[PDB]
Amino acid sequence: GFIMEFAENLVLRLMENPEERDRKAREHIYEMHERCKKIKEMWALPIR
Amino acid sequence: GGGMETNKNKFIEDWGSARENLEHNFRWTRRNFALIGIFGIALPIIVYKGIVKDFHMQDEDAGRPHRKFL
Amino acid sequence: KPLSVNDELMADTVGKYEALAWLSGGLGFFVGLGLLAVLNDKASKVPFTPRVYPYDNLRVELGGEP
Amino acid sequence: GRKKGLPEFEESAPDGFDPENPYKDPVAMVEMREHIVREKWIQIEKAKILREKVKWCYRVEGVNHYQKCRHLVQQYLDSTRGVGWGKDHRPIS
Amino acid sequence: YFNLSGLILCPVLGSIILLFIPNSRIRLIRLIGLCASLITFLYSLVLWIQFDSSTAKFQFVESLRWLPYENINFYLGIDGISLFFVILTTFLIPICILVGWSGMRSYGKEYIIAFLICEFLMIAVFCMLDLLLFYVFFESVLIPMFIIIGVWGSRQRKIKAAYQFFLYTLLGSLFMLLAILLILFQTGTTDLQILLTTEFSERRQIFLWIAFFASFAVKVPMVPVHIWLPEAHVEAPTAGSVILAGILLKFGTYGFLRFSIPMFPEATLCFTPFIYTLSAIAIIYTSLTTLRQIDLKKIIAYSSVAHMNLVTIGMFSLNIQGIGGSILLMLSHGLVSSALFLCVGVLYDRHKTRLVRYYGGLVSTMPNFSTIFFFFTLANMSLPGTSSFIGEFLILVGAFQRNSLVATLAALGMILGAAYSLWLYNRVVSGNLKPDFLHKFSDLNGREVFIFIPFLVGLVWMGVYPKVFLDCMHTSVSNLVQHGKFH
Amino acid sequence: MYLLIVFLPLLGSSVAGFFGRFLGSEGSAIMTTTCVSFSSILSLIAFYEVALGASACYLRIAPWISSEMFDASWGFLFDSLTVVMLIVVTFISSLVHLYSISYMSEDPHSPRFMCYLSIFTFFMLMLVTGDNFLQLFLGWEGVGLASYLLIHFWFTRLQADKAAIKAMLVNRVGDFGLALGILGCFTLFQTVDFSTIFACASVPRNSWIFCNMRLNAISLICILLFIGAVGKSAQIGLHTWLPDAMEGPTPVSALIHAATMVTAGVFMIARCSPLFEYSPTALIVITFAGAMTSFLAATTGILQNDLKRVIAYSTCSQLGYMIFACGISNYSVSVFHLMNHAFFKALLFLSAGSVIHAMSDEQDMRKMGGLASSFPLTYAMMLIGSLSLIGFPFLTGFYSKDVILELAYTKYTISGNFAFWLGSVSVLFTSYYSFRLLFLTFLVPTNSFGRDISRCHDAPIPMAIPLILLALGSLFVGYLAKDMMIGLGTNFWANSLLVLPKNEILAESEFAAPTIIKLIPILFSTLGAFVAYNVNLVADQFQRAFQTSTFCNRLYSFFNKRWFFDQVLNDFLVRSFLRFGYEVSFEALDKGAIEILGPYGISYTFRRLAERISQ
Amino acid sequence: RWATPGHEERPKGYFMNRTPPAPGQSRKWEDWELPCYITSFLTIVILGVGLNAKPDLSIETWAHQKALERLEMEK
Amino acid sequence: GDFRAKVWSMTGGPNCRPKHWRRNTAIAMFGVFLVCIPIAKLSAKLEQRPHMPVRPIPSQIWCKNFGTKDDYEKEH
Ligand SMILES: CCCCCCCCCCCCCCCCCC(=O)O[C@@H](COC(=O)CCCCCCCCCCCCCCC)COP(=O)(O)OCC[N+](C)(C)C
Numbered sequence A: 001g002f003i004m005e006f007a008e009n010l011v012l013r014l015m016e017n018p019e020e021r022d023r024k025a026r027e028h029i030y031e032m033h034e035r036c037k038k039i040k041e042m043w044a045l046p047i048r
Numbered sequence B: 001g002g003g004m005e006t007n008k009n010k011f012i013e014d015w016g017s018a019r020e021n022l023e024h025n026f027r028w029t030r031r032n033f034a035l036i037g038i039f040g041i042a043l044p045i046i047v048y049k050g051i052v053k054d055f056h057m058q059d060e061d062a063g064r065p066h067r068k069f070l
Numbered sequence C: 001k002p003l004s005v006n007d008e009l010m011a012d013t014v015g016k017y018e019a020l021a022w023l024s025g026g027l028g029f030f031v032g033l034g035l036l037a038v039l040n041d042k043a044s045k046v047p048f049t050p051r052v053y054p055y056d057n058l059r060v061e062l063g064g065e066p
Numbered sequence D: 001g002r003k004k005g006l007p008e009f010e011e012s013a014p015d016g017f018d019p020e021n022p023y024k025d026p027v028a029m030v031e032m033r034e035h036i037v038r039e040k041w042i043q044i045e046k047a048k049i050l051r052e053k054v055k056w057c058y059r060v061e062g063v064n065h066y067q068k069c070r071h072l073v074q075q076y077l078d079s080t081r082g083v084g085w086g087k088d089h090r091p092i093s
Numbered sequence E: 001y002f003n004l005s006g007l008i009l010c011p012v013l014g015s016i017i018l019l020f021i022p023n024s025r026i027r028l029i030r031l032i033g034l035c036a037s038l039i040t041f042l043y044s045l046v047l048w049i050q051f052d053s054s055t056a057k058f059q060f061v062e063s064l065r066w067l068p069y070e071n072i073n074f075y076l077g078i079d080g081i082s083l084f085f086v087i088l089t090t091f092l093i094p095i096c097i098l099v100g101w102s103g104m105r106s107y108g109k110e111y112i113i114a115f116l117i118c119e120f121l122m123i124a125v126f127c128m129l130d131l132l133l134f135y136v137f138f139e140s141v142l143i144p145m146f147i148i149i150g151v152w153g154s155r156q157r158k159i160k161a162a163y164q165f166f167l168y169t170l171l172g173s174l175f176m177l178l179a180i181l182l183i184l185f186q187t188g189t190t191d192l193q194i195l196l197t198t199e200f201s202e203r204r205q206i207f208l209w210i211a212f213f214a215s216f217a218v219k220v221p222m223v224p225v226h227i228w229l230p231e232a233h234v235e236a237p238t239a240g241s242v243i244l245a246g247i248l249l250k251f252g253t254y255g256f257l258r259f260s261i262p263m264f265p266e267a268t269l270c271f272t273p274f275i276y277t278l279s280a281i282a283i284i285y286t287s288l289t290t291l292r293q294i295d296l297k298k299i300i301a302y303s304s305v306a307h308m309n310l311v312t313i314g315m316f317s318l319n320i321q322g323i324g325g326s327i328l329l330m331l332s333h334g335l336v337s338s339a340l341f342l343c344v345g346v347l348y349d350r351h352k353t354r355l356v357r358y359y360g361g362l363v364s365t366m367p368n369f370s371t372i373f374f375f376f377t378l379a380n381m382s383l384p385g386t387s388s389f390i391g392e393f394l395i396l397v398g399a400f401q402r403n404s405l406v407a408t409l410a411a412l413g414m415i416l417g418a419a420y421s422l423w424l425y426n427r428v429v430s431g432n433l434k435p436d437f438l439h440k441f442s443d444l445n446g447r448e449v450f451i452f453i454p455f456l457v458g459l460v461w462m463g464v465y466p467k468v469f470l471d472c473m474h475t476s477v478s479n480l481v482q483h484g485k486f487h
Numbered sequence F: 001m002y003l004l005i006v007f008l009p010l011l012g013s014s015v016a017g018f019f020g021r022f023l024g025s026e027g028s029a030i031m032t033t034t035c036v037s038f039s040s041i042l043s044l045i046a047f048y049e050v051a052l053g054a055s056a057c058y059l060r061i062a063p064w065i066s067s068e069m070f071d072a073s074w075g076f077l078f079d080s081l082t083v084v085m086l087i088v089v090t091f092i093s094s095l096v097h098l099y100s101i102s103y104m105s106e107d108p109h110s111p112r113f114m115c116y117l118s119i120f121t122f123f124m125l126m127l128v129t130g131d132n133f134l135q136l137f138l139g140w141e142g143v144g145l146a147s148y149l150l151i152h153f154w155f156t157r158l159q160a161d162k163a164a165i166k167a168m169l170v171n172r173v174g175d176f177g178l179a180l181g182i183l184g185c186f187t188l189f190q191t192v193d194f195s196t197i198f199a200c201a202s203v204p205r206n207s208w209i210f211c212n213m214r215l216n217a218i219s220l221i222c223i224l225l226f227i228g229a230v231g232k233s234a235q236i237g238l239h240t241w242l243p244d245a246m247e248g249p250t251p252v253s254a255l256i257h258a259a260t261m262v263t264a265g266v267f268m269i270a271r272c273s274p275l276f277e278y279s280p281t282a283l284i285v286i287t288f289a290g291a292m293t294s295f296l297a298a299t300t301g302i303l304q305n306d307l308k309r310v311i312a313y314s315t316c317s318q319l320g321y322m323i324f325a326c327g328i329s330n331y332s333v334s335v336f337h338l339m340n341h342a343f344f345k346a347l348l349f350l351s352a353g354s355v356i357h358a359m360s361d362e363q364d365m366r367k368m369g370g371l372a373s374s375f376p377l378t379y380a381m382m383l384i385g386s387l388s389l390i391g392f393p394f395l396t397g398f399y400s401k402d403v404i405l406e407l408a409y410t411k412y413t414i415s416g417n418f419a420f421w422l423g424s425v426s427v428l429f430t431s432y433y434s435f436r437l438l439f440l441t442f443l444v445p446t447n448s449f450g451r452d453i454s455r456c457h458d459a460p461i462p463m464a465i466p467l468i469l470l471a472l473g474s475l476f477v478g479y480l481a482k483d484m485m486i487g488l489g490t491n492f493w494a495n496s497l498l499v500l501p502k503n504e505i506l507a508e509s510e511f512a513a514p515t516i517i518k519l520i521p522i523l524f525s526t527l528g529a530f531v532a533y534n535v536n537l538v539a540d541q542f543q544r545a546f547q548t549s550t551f552c553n554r555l556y557s558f559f560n561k562r563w564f565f566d567q568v569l570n571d572f573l574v575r576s577f578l579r580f581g582y583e584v585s586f587e588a589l590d591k592g593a594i595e596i597l598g599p600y601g602i603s604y605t606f607r608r609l610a611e612r613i614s615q
Numbered sequence G: 001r002w003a004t005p006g007h008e009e010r011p012k013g014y015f016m017n018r019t020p021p022a023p024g025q026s027r028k029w030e031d032w033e034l035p036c037y038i039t040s041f042l043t044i045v046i047l048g049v050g051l052n053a054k055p056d057l058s059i060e061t062w063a064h065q066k067a068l069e070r071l072e073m074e075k
Numbered sequence H: 001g002d003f004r005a006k007v008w009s010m011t012g013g014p015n016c017r018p019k020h021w022r023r024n025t026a027i028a029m030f031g032v033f034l035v036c037i038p039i040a041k042l043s044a045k046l047e048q049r050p051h052m053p054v055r056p057i058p059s060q061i062w063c064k065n066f067g068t069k070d071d072y073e074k075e076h
């Protein structure tokens, strides 16, 4: 009925989910570090 | 006189151009050498010594050894 | 009439150094009066003992240990 | 879609982090950093609450604030020593 | 769902649409450019609303592969530090478009297209979380700004200023690129979140920090390299100066906040007295050199060096008052300084001159301009109730806690800042008129009155209730204060 | 009801400045006068309620700055000290507003003048009703901005702009000192609020490292705050702005510089008394500076011929008196003398402006005389003001200056003796130049021109009601408020002012000294009056000594030209800094030295290098 | 002085230095006014209705209610 | 002069005197009165009086925070 109620129920819907954000960040760090290790070992390969 | 543009004066315009074209006006005299070697080489050193000594005296007051600021 | 290079910043009976000397004398008057006040030593000529308050100089009421 | 209400944070030291070699598990490092920031903010807010208590002790008491707010003032000044990112007095958290 | 992809794609669509429009349709070009800028600004404002202020993790993260093995990739994300920079760089563009509204018939479509490409490049700079791609968009701004300075310059000096600016930016850029390459080879990747969890050997911190400082100090002119800024700034259109001072001067400080203050916590502490020394003399020297300038745009351009060097004192204090209060100064400076160049642009468009000697007595012929000019004079001189004072005072209390001497030297900045700021206003506005030089006047039109309105509202709103901006940053700036610290 | 006290002047200014084109020169005056008068009556109820009812009110609107612990909210603190400043500032502001209705009757831009007056009153109210050190700073710098705006209200003049910019520079040095003091306050107590700082002002006994020096934390903060107080109150260090600031309108002189904004430093010292009491080193500095300022202004003001400038040095002397009265750690007497002076100095400025306006803006006393019969009312009013100023017995200026002098006598210390001596000689000098101003303007044979006398008109109603109210004040208010403020054991101040039990000498000031000491000011005033009469009304005029003695001429120049401050300080600081701006920083550091080693000074050898590749 | 009607029928000088339009007509808006005004209206609506309706998520609020809880548990 | 009558200023200009300043003055008071009502209502709500007055003061008619902070030990 009032603008404030709809506005807050809309903002709460627009805002992102916290747990999945942190989970994505942690998995990103894991995968990036693993890929970093593999890429460094790849660079370690000699030309011959 | 139906124009908003200024009626620029030769004296003012030339004075401003001279004041803005000062890049090519050094003669490398002793006054410039002394001036740039004092107020551009010594004052920064004095200030840097001031902050370094302030940090050192803050460190000694708390009893912690001096921090290697280098 | 070309303008001067420093044409952005522009007591005639006195000079800067002479007026500085006059100012130094005027302030030395204050300094000498302060030295005379020190020489008077009014602290030793106080006519009353220092005021003494009860309850140990109001220690508790002034934030002292209870 | 976040749930309505205040944010919820787990109040526990992230397991796996060891101060001997902090740069060992990167995820435990950022979690530990966030956690430490959270308790430093908790300490800051506790000091602020004590400051409010002292503030309203000075006004309600009046002239007698020297003996009535002594207990609060020393608590507030004891709690402002280890505030956080302030003077060289840094807490050993 | 509003993400960083749409905010960046909006200027792309705006620039592409005008790219294939006949130049004879001058009205349509202006309307479409202005509409694109306004839509981008509203998109940024919406992105502010859904910004979480309780997590230090980067928000609205987006990824796009760049190398085949995902070593380096387009990682876009914002935090409490770079959100307001994005909002400001999207807000300044419509003002720049509106500045050249009347004379747009001569510039053509290449003007709005250049400014929209500029907005595209600056939005991605504040959103990149990859060290290498941050450099790619860091130095992609040269081409649009080179074109803006050269094609639409005032006099024949535009060739020299563009060359000088380009050369300085290149010499900084490649010396930074070598450090970026060395970091990539050693660590393995260039992701910021990975580079913030990698221990750097103490010997490599000094070299990499110096190499990063070489490129950043040019764009935040410390002492030896603030000679390109005055010339390139004066030889620029009215809207061109707003971009150079509003945003282009915020790359150096943002680069320090994002890639220097955290990736090397040990190196930052060692070089703290060095930054304090450079910033202290820069505040003293520049605020003093400003008194003996005669060009209207060369005085305000020297009011930015003192303000921007006061920011680098705040960042290196490494506390909530310092780092947090330095951000408000740049938002305040991005509004106060860019508004002053609008005031000078108002005077220059009518009377094609910039010398302060020709100006005087405008209080009797342009009263609305005098009222607006005076207000931004007060903001430039750090008056309470203005956004500048909040940032200026928070930096001082953040540096006094670390070093009382540097806070004392920086405090004389407001002594000298209040000197030339009012003394310029007295010359230009107050005084008697000079009908011999100039005699026809016109006060602010509808555009100028409306353009200054968001600056007026956004300057006191931040100046009386800065809690709206501050509370969105404390979670993000507190994690920045301590990185290597664990106690 | 208390927010209305602060915001009515703001609303009046915001109406009279934004919509003055619809109200004209009369509606803009009515808006500001009505708003300030309603604020004044509200301050009267505030005095009946807080000061007399002994129930202070604390009002916080919203947080302004919220860092980790740098909290400086939008708080208003109304205690006994604040309410006195309210009933002084707002009442004087309303009377000045009423005065300016008739004073600015022919000036074209009257509405902007009233808008500036209202905004100044609003800033002063924010200053006095400040709960934090930042809201206090907000008012402390807004008051300087308003004074600068009002000093060059006639922007066409060049002297007005120079005076305004000099005032801003001096107030800016003062603001730098105050900002350093505030930064020191937050570093110790981690707060800027007055309640917390004054509650915890006794515990800290540590030492800091300030500018390569190890000093006391509290003493350094108190000295830094006193620097700001010196900057605003025109003390020994920084006072040259006040005499030059008379180029503004007379109502600007009467309010901006007589009653308010010069007492800002005294008010800040009195309010921060629970902090200044724990730094005995700062009190010595305050006492010395106050004594020096009083004596120097008294010596400078005896040879001026401008009507407005003589009164400015009287204000400087009175402010010096208040300052070293604060230095004896007796803040009640300082505020009492502040409130007393804000009456008989505003009256003096208003009567002088009434004389000047009727005399075709003639400001030189050498060109007026025999105005007593022509200007009966204004002559009587200036007589009342001068008698109060010199400290005539049983008058407003007698209940405060005499108490200050006898208190300075009983402060048996090195600093107290110096202040007592200077304040004793300053009484004689003040009597001399006050009576010279009274004699030359009104009682000597006429020296004016025929045209000035022909066009004469005494003060009309709008310029006479504030005068009469100020006369009643300068007659009775000192006696009425003598008991509540400087009485023995009075609880009127409650917790507003703190005086430690150790440094309390109010009781001995009354019965511990010979009766001669209590009569020294009266004897010196009589001597000064006799000297002034014998040198002005009847004398052989031995001025031939000034034409034959080289020392006498230079001595006359020394007192006339403000002890050679403006000339010496200009040449040795302002001119030196102007040269430091161009001849070095712009001429050598960044002109070509960076260029020659930069990209084109010598780096253009690539033209002399690329062309050689043909080899 | 305080009773005589004024002489200036309308304020001197036109507002924004624009001549009033033809009688019985209206000020024709420029090509930028409508988009700028709808933008300025939407900005106010979004900021007033969005900032005041977003949840009070902050580190000075969660920490406040956590400190206010641990401050009493110590007793 | 002749040209200062063609300059628009918010304050009104030199010697400004509109024909209907009486009516405009009355409106301005009413506008100031209307905006002063919420300020007075706001002030009476956020104001705190820790001490009961010696005698009945007029602020007790509207203000209700009299002797409320006496338990300062539980302040936030
Ligand atoms: C920002 C925080 C501090 C705020 C302080 C505000 C102090 C006033 C600042 C502006 C004052 C105006 C100074 C610049 C303009 C110089 C005079 C001028 O030209 O202004 C016009 C416009 O009138 C004004 O001055 C309006 C500006 C002041 C009125 C608005 C102020 C509203 C209250 C102050 C702000 C409220 C909040 C303050 C606290 C944060 C007046 O012209 P006239 O008097 O008619 O004479 C000129 C001759 N001729 C007509 C021929 C052109």
Ligand SMILES: CCCCCCCCCCCCCCCCCCCC(=O)O[C@H](COC(=O)CCCCCCCCCCCCCC)COP(=O)(O)OCCN
Binding pocket: E087, E088, E091, E453, E454, E456, E457, E458, E460, E461, E464, E465, E467, E468, G043, G044, G047, G048, G051, G052, G053, G056
């Ligand atoms: C015709 C003009 C003539 C000249 C006028 C001169 C200036 C006069 C106007 C002064 C400016 C007024 C702005 C308001 C300042 C005081 C109020 C502060 C705002 C405020 O307290 O509310 C916060 C935001 O809401 C809001 O109310 C936000 C709405 C504000 C809209 C402002 C739009 C400015 C546009 C600037 C664009 C650029 C922005 C900068 C990048 C929420 O408070 P909270 O956080 O505590 O939430 C608590 C929830 N439980």
